[PDB]
Each structure stands twice: as structure tokens, then as C-alpha cells.
């Protein structure tokens, strides 16, 4: 299909309860494969998918070394951000950072990322050109300053174009069994009598990988985009995903409504009616 790799970082200060909490996870598409939790006892980066366990000990020593320095870097940066925003040392704050790449069917870079958030708000981001920044405010302008004078864009760009794509392609081979297989959704239409007057039709999609999926309730072939209830896509817990889409319909006019399922694991988009 189309594939991606991302590393997610959260640092959460907790003044008076030790060092900041640092958790980082790595993903290939919607499969978690590495994790590093600083609150683990003697923390190392650990595997979270079978196709990465094969990497040698040097792989894992290099990953743990990186996670430790990053946790140190966010400890500096968390204090630095308190200066940049004229804040107290009493409070708890959150530094987030995501970076990674997207590749197409060719295996070539579609897009690289590297963006930061502080207390839940965009801070500084590498732009899609991987050579210019977008600073969210006058504090992040201080960083864009420090990062332009270091040619950080040039170095992020070297990573995102080279190694990021290199190793994602590698993982797509080591884990082709699962990373390259799409589990199609199992679909069913349920009918829920709410009262004498109306019943709810729920279009289910279960056990699908990846998470990308589109469920749509059409009335007379026209999308009920406004009056459709649609839950956020949720993890089953065994790597697959679930979602449902529902509409409150009058009893009797049920057969006007069609549910359309779109998922890369399915050959054709599905057309589902409520069938008694």
C-alpha cells in the first residue's frame, strides 16, 4: 500500500516528583514496534512486534542510547521553555515531538515530518520542504533562530530522505507478512429498536488492518454526512481495528439507506443494506 514510520515523544514535567516522565513509541503504519518508558526500572528500548526482535544487539544499544539522550534533551528544553514563556517552576508541562516519513508504492519519500508541541499547542515544525520552519509564536522564533544557525533543516532533511526511508523499507521486508497484508473488515448491519417510532441502523466494520477506513450511510444514495453517528476508529487490542457508523431512521423507510465501506483490504467498496 502506502506506508509510513513515526516516532512519538512525550515529556511531562512533574515538579516535586522527580525527573520528567519520558515515553516514546515508534510505529510503522498502525503497528507499534518499539517503546521506551523512562519510568521503567532500567530502561532500554524494547521490541513490540516480532519483525524487529531480529535486529542485533547493536541496534538495540543504539536505540536505547538515543532515547536516553532525548530524555535528557527534553529535560533541558522543558526548563528552557519555562524561560521562553515566563512561567513558574511549580507547574507540570508537556513537550511533544513527532518525526518520521511517508513512502509510496515505489518506496520513495512522499513526505517527511518533524514537529513540536508545548502544552498541547503547535510550537515549531519542519515544513514539507524540509528546509524551512513554521514558528508558532515569538518563543518558537527563538528556536527557529537557533536551528537556522545550526542548519538543522539540512540535517533533518538528510535523515528523513535517507535513513528514514532506508529502514522503513527494511521493516516492510522483515515484517512483510503483517506490514504488507491488509486485513479486510468484517461487516454487518444491525437494527436497534429504540422506540415504537424509530430504530437505529449501525454499520459495523471489525478486524481490519490498517486503520484507514471510510464508512458512509447514504440515504437514497445520498450521503447523510450530517445526521450520521460515527465513532473514532478504535483498536481491538490484537492489532486490528474497529469502527461503526449509525443513523437514526424511521421504521419502514429503512431500505432507502445504503452503507458504503471503503478499505484497502477490500477489492471493491462494499454496499450493505439492513437485511432481515
Amino acid at each position: 500500500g502506502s506506508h509510513s514510520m513515526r516516532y512519538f515523544h512525550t515529556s511531562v514535567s512533574r515538579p516535586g516528583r522527580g525527573e520528567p516522565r519520558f515515553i516514546t513509541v515508534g510505529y510503522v503504519d498502525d503497528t507499534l514496534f518499539v517503546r521506551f518508558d523512562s519510568d521503567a526500572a532500567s530502561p532500554r528500548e524494547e521490541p513490540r512486534a516480532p519483525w524487529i526482535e531480529q535486529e542485533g544487539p547493536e541496534y538495540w544499544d543504539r536505540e536505547t542510547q538515543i532515547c536516553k539522550a532525548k530524555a535528557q534533551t527534553d529535560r533541558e528544553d522543558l526548563r528552557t521553555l519555562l524561560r521562553y514563556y515566563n512561567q513558574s517552576e511549580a507547574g507540570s508541562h508537556t513537550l511533544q515531538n513527532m518525526y518520521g516519513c511517508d513512502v509510496g508504492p515505489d518506496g520513495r519519500l512522499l513526505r517527511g515530518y518533524h514537529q513540536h508541541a508545548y502544552d498541547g499547542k503547535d510550537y515549531i515544525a519542519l515544513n514539507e520542504d524540509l528546509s524551512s520552519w513554521t514558528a508558532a509564536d515569538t518563543a518558537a522564533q527563538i528556536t527557529q533562530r537557533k536551528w537556522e544557525a545550526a542548519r538543522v533543516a539540512e540535517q533533518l532533511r538528510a535523515y528523513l530522505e535517507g535513513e528514514c526511508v532506508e529502514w522503513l523499507r527494511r521493516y516492510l521486508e522483515n515484517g512483510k507478512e503483517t506490514l504488507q497484508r491488509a486485513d479486510p473488515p468484517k461487516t454487518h448491519v444491525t437494527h436497534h429498536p429504540i422506540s415504537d417510532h424509530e430504530a437505529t441502523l449501525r454499520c459495523w466494520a471489525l478486524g481490519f488492518y490498517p486503520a484507514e477506513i471510510t464508512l458512509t450511510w447514504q440515504r437514497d444514495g445520498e450521503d447523510q454526512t450530517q445526521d450520521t453517528e460515527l465513532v473514532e476508529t478504535r483498536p481491538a487490542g490484537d492489532r486490528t481495528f474497529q469502527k461503526w457508523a449509525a443513523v437514526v431512521v424511521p421504521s419502514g423507510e429503512e431500505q432507502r439507506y445504503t452503507c458504503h465501506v471503503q478499505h484497502e483490504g477490500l477489492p471493491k467498496p462494499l454496499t450493505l443494506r439492513w437485511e432481515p
Binding site: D77, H116, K146, Y159
Partner: peptide, 9 residues
């Protein structure tokens, strides 16, 4: 795998 180098904010 992860990028070797990061930079202080």
C-alpha cells in the same frame, strides 16, 4: 531506527 542527533530548543 531513530535519528542520531537532536537539537536543543
Amino acid at each position: 531506527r531513530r535519528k542520531w542527533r537532536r537539537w536543543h530548543l
